[PDB]
Design a protein around this ligand. Sequence first.
Ligand SMILES: *[C@@H]1O[C@H](CO[C@H]2O[C@@H](C)[C@@H](O)[C@@H](O)[C@@H]2O)[C@@H](O[C@@H]2O[C@H](CO)[C@@H](O)[C@H](O)[C@H]2NC(C)=O)[C@H](O)[C@H]1NC(C)=O
Ligand SMILES: *[C@@H]1O[C@H](CO[C@H]2O[C@@H](C)[C@@H](O)[C@@H](O)[C@@H]2O)[C@@H](O[C@@H]2O[C@H](CO)[C@@H](O)[C@H](O)[C@H]2NC(C)=O)[C@H](O)[C@H]1NC(C)=O
Ligand SMILES: *[C@@H]1O[C@H](CO[C@H]2O[C@@H](C)[C@@H](O)[C@@H](O)[C@@H]2O)[C@@H](O[C@@H]2O[C@H](CO)[C@@H](O)[C@H](O)[C@H]2NC(C)=O)[C@H](O)[C@H]1NC(C)=O
Ligand SMILES: *[C@H]1O[C@H](CO[C@H]2O[C@@H](C)[C@@H](O)[C@@H](O)[C@@H]2O)[C@@H](O[C@@H]2O[C@H](CO)[C@@H](O)[C@H](O)[C@H]2NC(C)=O)[C@H](O)[C@H]1NC(C)=O
Ligand SMILES: *[C@H]1O[C@H](CO[C@H]2O[C@@H](C)[C@@H](O)[C@@H](O)[C@@H]2O)[C@@H](O[C@@H]2O[C@H](CO)[C@@H](O)[C@H](O)[C@H]2NC(C)=O)[C@H](O)[C@H]1NC(C)=O
Ligand SMILES: *[C@H]1O[C@H](CO[C@H]2O[C@@H](C)[C@@H](O)[C@@H](O)[C@@H]2O)[C@@H](O[C@@H]2O[C@H](CO)[C@@H](O)[C@H](O)[C@H]2NC(C)=O)[C@H](O)[C@H]1NC(C)=O
Ligand SMILES: *[C@@H]1O[C@H](CO)[C@@H](O)[C@H](O)[C@H]1NC(C)=O
Ligand SMILES: *[C@@H]1O[C@H](CO)[C@@H](O)[C@H](O)[C@H]1NC(C)=O
Ligand SMILES: *[C@@H]1O[C@H](CO)[C@@H](O)[C@H](O)[C@H]1NC(C)=O
Ligand SMILES: *[C@@H]1O[C@H](CO)[C@@H](O)[C@H](O)[C@H]1NC(C)=O
Ligand SMILES: *[C@@H]1O[C@H](CO)[C@@H](O)[C@H](O)[C@H]1NC(C)=O
Ligand SMILES: *[C@@H]1O[C@H](CO)[C@@H](O)[C@H](O)[C@H]1NC(C)=O
Ligand SMILES: *[C@@H]1O[C@H](CO)[C@@H](O)[C@H](O)[C@H]1NC(C)=O
Ligand SMILES: *[C@@H]1O[C@H](CO)[C@@H](O)[C@H](O)[C@H]1NC(C)=O
Ligand SMILES: *[C@@H]1O[C@H](CO)[C@@H](O)[C@H](O)[C@H]1NC(C)=O
Ligand SMILES: *[C@@H]1O[C@H](CO)[C@@H](O)[C@H](O)[C@H]1NC(C)=O
Ligand SMILES: *[C@@H]1O[C@H](CO)[C@@H](O)[C@H](O)[C@H]1NC(C)=O
Ligand SMILES: *[C@@H]1O[C@H](CO)[C@@H](O)[C@H](O)[C@H]1NC(C)=O
Ligand SMILES: *[P@@](C)(=O)OCCCC
Ligand SMILES: *[P@@](C)(=O)OCCCC
Ligand SMILES: *[P@@](C)(=O)OCCCC
Ligand SMILES: [Cl-]
Ligand SMILES: [Cl-]
Ligand SMILES: [Cl-]
Ligand SMILES: [Cl-]
Ligand SMILES: [Cl-]
Ligand SMILES: [Cl-]
Ligand SMILES: [Cl-]
Ligand SMILES: [Cl-]
Ligand SMILES: [Cl-]
Ligand code: NA
Ligand code: NA
Ligand code: NA
Ligand code: NA
Ligand code: NA
Ligand code: NA
Ligand code: NA
Ligand code: NA
Ligand code: NA
Lengths: 527, 527, 527
Amino acid sequence: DIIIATKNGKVRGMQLTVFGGTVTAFLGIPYAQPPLGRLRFKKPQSLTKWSDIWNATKYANSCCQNIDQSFPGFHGSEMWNPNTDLSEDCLYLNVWIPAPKPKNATVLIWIYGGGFQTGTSSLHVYDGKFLARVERVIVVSMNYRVGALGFLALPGNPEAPGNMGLFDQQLALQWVQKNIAAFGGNPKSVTLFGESAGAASVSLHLLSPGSHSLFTRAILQSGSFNAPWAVTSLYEARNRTLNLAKLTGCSRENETEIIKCLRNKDPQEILLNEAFVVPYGTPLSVNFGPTVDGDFLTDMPDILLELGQFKKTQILVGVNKDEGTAFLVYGAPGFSKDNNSIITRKEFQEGLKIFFPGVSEFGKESILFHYTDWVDDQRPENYREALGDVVGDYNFICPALEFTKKFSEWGNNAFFYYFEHRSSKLPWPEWMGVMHGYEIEFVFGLPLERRDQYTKAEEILSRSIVKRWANFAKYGNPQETQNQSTSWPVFKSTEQKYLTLNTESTRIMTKLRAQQCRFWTSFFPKV
Amino acid sequence: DIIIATKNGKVRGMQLTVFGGTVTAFLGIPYAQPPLGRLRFKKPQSLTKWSDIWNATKYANSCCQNIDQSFPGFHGSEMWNPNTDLSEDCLYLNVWIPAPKPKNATVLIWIYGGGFQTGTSSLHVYDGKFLARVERVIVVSMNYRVGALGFLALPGNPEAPGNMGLFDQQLALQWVQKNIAAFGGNPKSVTLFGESAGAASVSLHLLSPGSHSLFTRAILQSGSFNAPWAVTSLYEARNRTLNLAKLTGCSRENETEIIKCLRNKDPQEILLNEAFVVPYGTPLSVNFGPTVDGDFLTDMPDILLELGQFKKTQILVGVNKDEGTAFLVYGAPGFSKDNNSIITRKEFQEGLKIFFPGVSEFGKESILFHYTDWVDDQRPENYREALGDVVGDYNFICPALEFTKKFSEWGNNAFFYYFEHRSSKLPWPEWMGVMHGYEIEFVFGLPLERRDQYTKAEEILSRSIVKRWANFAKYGNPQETQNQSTSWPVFKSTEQKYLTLNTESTRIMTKLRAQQCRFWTSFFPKV
Amino acid sequence: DIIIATKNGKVRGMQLTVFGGTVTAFLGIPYAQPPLGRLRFKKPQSLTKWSDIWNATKYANSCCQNIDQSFPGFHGSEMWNPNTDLSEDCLYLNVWIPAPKPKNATVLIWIYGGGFQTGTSSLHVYDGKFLARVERVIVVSMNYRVGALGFLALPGNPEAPGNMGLFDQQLALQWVQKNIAAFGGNPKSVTLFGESAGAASVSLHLLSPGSHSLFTRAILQSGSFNAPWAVTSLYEARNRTLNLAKLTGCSRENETEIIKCLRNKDPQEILLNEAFVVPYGTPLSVNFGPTVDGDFLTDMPDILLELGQFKKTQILVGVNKDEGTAFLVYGAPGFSKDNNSIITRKEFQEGLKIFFPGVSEFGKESILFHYTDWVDDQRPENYREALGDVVGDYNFICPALEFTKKFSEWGNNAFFYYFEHRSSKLPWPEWMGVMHGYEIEFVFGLPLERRDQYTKAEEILSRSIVKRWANFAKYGNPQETQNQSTSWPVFKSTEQKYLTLNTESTRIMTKLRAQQCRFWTSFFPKV
Ligand SMILES: *[C@@H]1O[C@H](CO[C@H]2O[C@@H](C)[C@@H](O)[C@@H](O)[C@@H]2O)[C@@H](O[C@@H]2O[C@H](CO)[C@@H](O)[C@H](O)[C@H]2NC(C)=O)[C@H](O)[C@H]1NC(C)=O
Ligand SMILES: *[C@@H]1O[C@H](CO[C@H]2O[C@@H](C)[C@@H](O)[C@@H](O)[C@@H]2O)[C@@H](O[C@@H]2O[C@H](CO)[C@@H](O)[C@H](O)[C@H]2NC(C)=O)[C@H](O)[C@H]1NC(C)=O
Ligand SMILES: *[C@@H]1O[C@H](CO[C@H]2O[C@@H](C)[C@@H](O)[C@@H](O)[C@@H]2O)[C@@H](O[C@@H]2O[C@H](CO)[C@@H](O)[C@H](O)[C@H]2NC(C)=O)[C@H](O)[C@H]1NC(C)=O
Ligand SMILES: *[C@H]1O[C@H](CO[C@H]2O[C@@H](C)[C@@H](O)[C@@H](O)[C@@H]2O)[C@@H](O[C@@H]2O[C@H](CO)[C@@H](O)[C@H](O)[C@H]2NC(C)=O)[C@H](O)[C@H]1NC(C)=O
Ligand SMILES: *[C@H]1O[C@H](CO[C@H]2O[C@@H](C)[C@@H](O)[C@@H](O)[C@@H]2O)[C@@H](O[C@@H]2O[C@H](CO)[C@@H](O)[C@H](O)[C@H]2NC(C)=O)[C@H](O)[C@H]1NC(C)=O
Ligand SMILES: *[C@H]1O[C@H](CO[C@H]2O[C@@H](C)[C@@H](O)[C@@H](O)[C@@H]2O)[C@@H](O[C@@H]2O[C@H](CO)[C@@H](O)[C@H](O)[C@H]2NC(C)=O)[C@H](O)[C@H]1NC(C)=O
Ligand SMILES: *[C@@H]1O[C@H](CO)[C@@H](O)[C@H](O)[C@H]1NC(C)=O
Ligand SMILES: *[C@@H]1O[C@H](CO)[C@@H](O)[C@H](O)[C@H]1NC(C)=O
Ligand SMILES: *[C@@H]1O[C@H](CO)[C@@H](O)[C@H](O)[C@H]1NC(C)=O
Ligand SMILES: *[C@@H]1O[C@H](CO)[C@@H](O)[C@H](O)[C@H]1NC(C)=O
Ligand SMILES: *[C@@H]1O[C@H](CO)[C@@H](O)[C@H](O)[C@H]1NC(C)=O
Ligand SMILES: *[C@@H]1O[C@H](CO)[C@@H](O)[C@H](O)[C@H]1NC(C)=O
Ligand SMILES: *[C@@H]1O[C@H](CO)[C@@H](O)[C@H](O)[C@H]1NC(C)=O
Ligand SMILES: *[C@@H]1O[C@H](CO)[C@@H](O)[C@H](O)[C@H]1NC(C)=O
Ligand SMILES: *[C@@H]1O[C@H](CO)[C@@H](O)[C@H](O)[C@H]1NC(C)=O
Ligand SMILES: *[C@@H]1O[C@H](CO)[C@@H](O)[C@H](O)[C@H]1NC(C)=O
Ligand SMILES: *[C@@H]1O[C@H](CO)[C@@H](O)[C@H](O)[C@H]1NC(C)=O
Ligand SMILES: *[C@@H]1O[C@H](CO)[C@@H](O)[C@H](O)[C@H]1NC(C)=O
Ligand SMILES: *[P@@](C)(=O)OCCCC
Ligand SMILES: *[P@@](C)(=O)OCCCC
Ligand SMILES: *[P@@](C)(=O)OCCCC
Ligand SMILES: [Cl-]
Ligand SMILES: [Cl-]
Ligand SMILES: [Cl-]
Ligand SMILES: [Cl-]
Ligand SMILES: [Cl-]
Ligand SMILES: [Cl-]
Ligand SMILES: [Cl-]
Ligand SMILES: [Cl-]
Ligand SMILES: [Cl-]
Ligand code: NA
Ligand code: NA
Ligand code: NA
Ligand code: NA
Ligand code: NA
Ligand code: NA
Ligand code: NA
Ligand code: NA
Ligand code: NA
């Protein structure tokens, strides 16, 4: 039996057996008042106080959200679907601690991805018990609101001010500040890490003044706020919010009245409409996301980044070799997971049309031009590979690299990785390569689990990443010092060294996707 | 309805419609006891406290001051004349805030020019509502005492200690420190900006110990305290103060008695005499200005500048291409606004006599020599252009450049601009070029106003300056980051880069008026 | 009438007319309990408190001390003799302030010389009223105990712990910290300056932990603690203290008993014996001076200097062209002030014998060797000039230069001057040149006094030093910025630039007395 007195009252956890030892898990600790009825669309408000012992012994409700139904029954997609009841009552967090209770452990806070429209901390691939067992770090994760219910904005007006999901996150980070020492945590040693939209969230916490003092350092996997799907403009945010009212027969006059009306709709009606607040989406649509609200975000992030207004600290940033592929089977013509997807020039052009709907003909010709001077053999897989690279480079790799350049020019240490190992257990087909999302299991140390059959090499690779992440968190420096590993150099502008993470040959390389990033970064934004 | 509780009690403002949105204006908030009767010539004293709601809904009294009557009915001069009642009761300030109320906005404090003899915050070209609407900054301006009533000095003696107008300013800056957060302001992010005498005031706040902690950074348009009209010596201050007594039949024995006597004169009698406390003025006379009082100013400013005694922070400094011209029609022979003013050598010499009255024959020959080796064609406009340059270089550009050299040698970032756009709406004739004072409307964003017919190019130029000023204020760096603009480099000694602001071609240049500034700066002061 | 409430109670000063204006002088303010009876030889103790108004309107008792009787009636010597009653009751200080009272003036604290055996703040050449009038600085000076009564040491034992005179000084510096703001002073801007033993005192305050926070910066004229007369060893201090007891029939058993006995002797008996506690003195004997007591001084000063244990701040250090001469007429054979003192080789050798009594024959041959390879003409004044240089170099110039090297190697700004003007009013004969002590009148601004007939050039030189000293005090940098003067560069090791102060040609020079200082500094200490 294990009970911890927090600032809001007692909580009980369970004992887990991990890897020959023990871990104490507190699942589903509330961190805010349930945001229901009159609190829907409003910033999270703080917890009442409680008599009795709270039983944090099972995962809590995931937040309301649409589910991916493109591959029903397929483990590749379904592993990302929520594994607990959906409810509006979803502001809870989990804590995993070493046994015996440590004395001043470094704290890792995970923020999940899902396009700001989906995700949940209770997923199998986010289970923190392994990191706690092996590295003696404490691992925290929280649920935050997604979709309209999390990011509906009607500018300035506090009935729906914008960024509610980011504030749920910020309020959980605070809960860590006030309570984590009771669990044996060191509030002065907190690293945020997250992937995709979770990684862009982490990048925004770096920019947010209310976040400055709620963490020490940061890890960004395949995401940053300068990615093109990450921040909704005020223009498009209003168009969307009013388009939603129209669809739910909530078009009114007085703005507060539109919110009051939307607060009377049932969650399902709002979920059902979210998809259509846009004339045409892509498989990369973020219908409701971060906006510049003058509160969490005080100006457009490009400006803040460029002029150096953000927390000075170390960052670890990285991406996967085939980020783009996973998106092509959600709309691109002649793509399937159940065949090799050898496509034609004509399919590719149509492809660009799906991914770049509001872009001029010339703009599209310009991508075709940059990505189809091969180099050279009349390889059939030419066009399929180029469409993956197009989507990866524009959406993930290039924005990640630029964020890293920009951040390090203000003087701080940064480390960049390029993950190129395809999991032996990957259920998607071989042509999709080293996919978006599939370094996570390596970071949480799933292949360490003996009775799960990853390879021996995967076990060793995982053991080595877990160590680098943990060393990063505790000491600002992601080295594996014992087993005579390849030293990971800092990323500077000019040299721009990165580290390759693979199962065979770990290498130091320079200037990842140089030619491609000149295209996305200097030419394409003018278009 | 909008009411803010301040430290002195409540105030009500009005709602303005600007550019499709709203701005809240509080006009005429008092910031000091009215300096009347026994408080005339004394440092401002602090506000009593008040029950009821103060109605800050119209501009307040401008301070007592003579008016320019050289061009009655001419919009070019009259636009600078005071647009509210003159009264001794004039220590008030205005606040403009974004709607919805922001959370921690950067604050811009404007200090007007007028030779320390004239000016008022209520002028059309100082209306802060545009900056507030477009940049979401808060804009403050205040009225401070000018002429004898603001700068009469009888050394050490506190009945008339000197610098009262500078202390009115300092006391308004304080009012910002104590109250601005109630308006949504961030007291820790205050930029002072001002033009001409207003710009020299800003430079003196940098030197004043009582000001150090009342602002963050500073913007100086066409003015600095090392300009030759900016600081009155103790010698000339006494001669003047006693000359005024003599003229008003206030010559006494006991010094306090002379003040007591002057405090019995009516404002108009003092105004009427101010002009003659000098044997001969120029169109650049500052009969009553800043002095070294051992209080606001603790030593002569040249020494403080040279030896590095001032606030360490970023500055933005600049000047206009034809600063000198506006002064030539206020006394220089054969100059008129109603004709081209082609003058002769003989007129030019007489001209120097008007502008450099107490200077030796040789001194005057030396200006003629430096400014009349052309380069070369027998152009008729030769002499007219040289007299403008003489007055500009000596009075504005050269002192501004030297102040910037001197300030940056102590390690801080500085930015220098050279404004060379002549407003399409300028009522003065073409030969007067890019005049003193006419970048102000661009900085306050008047050409942004659609229904006012500035050009489209002027709109775009203004939009770009407003952004650079605002970025400067918020982040210390005056870049326009979005529209791929010319980056503005820091001004260092040795390289001395500056930025040109025009409607066509924005450029990086080096060593503005190199030859001319060697003349004014190294040779002329010996004379 | 002018009354200031201090922490010990009220004081009244007088009004002085200086140079067309006014200065307020408080003469003889007590700063410690009178150190009489049972307090003789003990550290100074703090002031009781007082009702009534203290009348600080005349100079106070100078401390007990022997007088120079070598030239009775001669203004050259007698100007250094005490000009008030000698008494044991002598711990008082003077304050001079600008009129009108300033607001936050920089403070100059003067510490007089006199070999630690003589001196007094009430001397004519230490009158602070001129500095106060002209520079608007506040000037403080204090009386501190000298000779046995100030520096008697019987190690560790607190009845006579050592350094009492240094602690009198330290306690006056404290009095400045607690009280000077009431006079208009800024306690955070205090420069210590002093000459000879006063200059060595200043150098020891830099080393003393109890002094660290009682001043900002320091000026050393012809003195430093590494000079060879400056610090008595523990060995020689005991030998002396016991030799004094023996002479006064106070030889006892219990050490406290010897003090108790000496506290019963009358001041005159102690004064009369001080001279003989040494088998043989020189005209540079310091029979009772600073010692390493483990309290004011925590280790030998050479070590502290060399290893960088002292206050980090700016210093101004300098010396006079003929420091040595004044000492030759107090014992050196064939020297007189009443003739040219052309001496022989044989006289010179005897001379070395007077000045280096306990030094080996070889040691003496070594000085002769270094100082008598001329360069070359058979000039009669050869030997007379060399004996002056010998005494100057060893006692003043060389130790001053070494102190400056050593101090600047730890990173702080230092300025070095070489004063080479012989006063037109000097009563000593021409051959004695630019003597020890005769830059003081220039620093206090005596030649500024119109009705005193120094030359016009001397007036201008003085005006310029007063300004450099004052700029040093206020701003850390001794420049004269207005009258286009020679800029004074910092003294670094390697380059070692110094400034020459003379009436004609002010110059930047390098490596003063290079050859000579290698001799005194590297070879002579081994001997
Ligand atoms: C790979 O599959 C795609 C995708 O669509 C198909 O899925 C397959 C697994 C198959 O079972 C089939 O029934 C299904 O249509 C193929 O593209 C399609 O080609 C078909 C038939 O010619 C067209 O009707 C469609 O327009 C197009 N479908 C879509 C959804 O775009 C593709 O040809 C196939 N590629 C191969 C074998 O290389
Ligand atoms: C430009 O005008 C000046 C200024 O004075 C004149 O203003 C004009 C607009 C005109 O209407 C006229 O009545 C008025 O005098 C001229 O200089 C003047 O020249 C006049 C006539 O010869 C002399 O009497 C004056 O001394 C002198 N006036 C002043 C006030 O200095 C100037 O000649 C004219 N320049 C041109 C046409 O190039
Ligand atoms: C300069 O004077 C010295 C010092 O002593 C003398 O002082 C003089 C002013 C003079 O009035 C005289 O009476 C007095 O003795 C002279 O050295 C002295 O030489 C004398 C006479 O030969 C010797 O008896 C002494 O040993 C020696 N005196 C001392 C005190 O050392 C010196 O010769 C003279 N120098 C000249 C004229 O160049
Ligand atoms: C945002 O504003 C309008 C809103 O019109 C939308 O109504 C919503 C409730 C939703 O159902 C959505 O499908 C619909 O788009 C957008 O107008 C669209 O633009 C086209 C012209 O290209 C017109 O045909 C329609 O008005 C509408 N589209 C359709 C398919 O009916 C508008 O484009 C959008 N603004 C943007 C994206 O900047
Ligand atoms: C400051 O002191 C005197 C004051 O004389 C002045 O009296 C004033 C009240 C006012 O009316 C003003 O016009 C007048 O100047 C100055 O004396 C002037 O100097 C000239 C000699 O060049 C004499 O003729 C007069 O005393 C007087 N001028 C006139 C036109 O009558 C004095 O010059 C001034 N000091 C300065 C500027 O340094
Ligand atoms: C310190 O200790 C002795 C003390 O002897 C001294 O007695 C004093 C009271 C005083 O009168 C003083 O004149 C006398 O010196 C010193 O002894 C001296 O050394 C010489 C030998 O060179 C002997 O002749 C005497 O004992 C004495 N001198 C005289 C002239 O009588 C001792 O030298 C000294 N220690 C040092 C300087 O290190
Ligand atoms: C928490 O679980 C334990 C099981 O041992 C139980 O005793 C306790 O009542 C639980 N809390 C509840 C049911 O609210
Ligand atoms: C934990 O470590 C921090 C420094 O990182 C320290 O200041 C804090 O007091 C420690 N708390 C403990 C040991 O409980
Ligand atoms: C609209 O209604 C809201 C909510 O009831 C009210 O408080 C507000 O003042 C109204 N605003 C306008 C602009 O009519
Ligand atoms: C280091 O070495 C051993 C094998 O020699 C391995 O089992 C262990 O996992 C390694 N530790 C890390 C942190 O990689
Ligand atoms: C301020 O103006 C309002 C107008 O609505 C008024 O009600 C109030 O009395 C005013 N204050 C005055 C007149 O002092
Ligand atoms: C505003 O920002 C400053 C830092 O510039 C911060 O210290 C202050 O507390 C903030 N106040 C708010 C958010 O109200
Ligand atoms: C002159 O009168 C003033 C004001 O009444 C008085 O307080 C002051 O002491 C007097 N000064 C002189 C120098 O006569
Ligand atoms: C940037 O670009 C657009 C036009 O593409 C323009 O309307 C807007 O005013 C510009 N913003 C700034 C700050 O200049
Ligand atoms: C100080 O001097 C004044 C002279 O005006 C006198 O009134 C006062 O009594 C003096 N203090 C004394 C004598 O103790
Ligand atoms: C005097 O100046 C210091 C800084 O050198 C400042 O901290 C202090 O408060 C000032 N005191 C005054 C103006 O009374
Ligand atoms: C000597 O006498 C002193 C002073 O009376 C006394 O306090 C001390 O204990 C004695 N010391 C010795 C060593 O006899
Ligand atoms: C500077 O210049 C003037 C003479 O032109 C002189 O009288 C004054 O004393 C000088 N000031 C200083 C500080 O030397
Ligand atoms: P990640 C899976 O959170 O983001 C991809 C961006 C578009 C939805
Ligand atoms: P600005 C118009 O305040 O200053 C010009 C200087 C002389 C009056
Ligand atoms: P200053 C005259 O105090 O020192 C000379 C050193 C030996 C007495
Ligand atoms: Cl690759
Ligand atoms: Cl084609
Ligand atoms: Cl390379
Ligand atoms: Cl030009
Ligand atoms: Cl001529
Ligand atoms: Cl150049
Ligand atoms: Cl010399
Ligand atoms: Cl010999
Ligand atoms: Cl050299
Ligand atoms: Na995913
Ligand atoms: Na590995
Ligand atoms: Na590449
Ligand atoms: Na103007
Ligand atoms: Na532009
Ligand atoms: Na030029
Ligand atoms: Na002396
Ligand atoms: Na000089
Ligand atoms: Na030399």
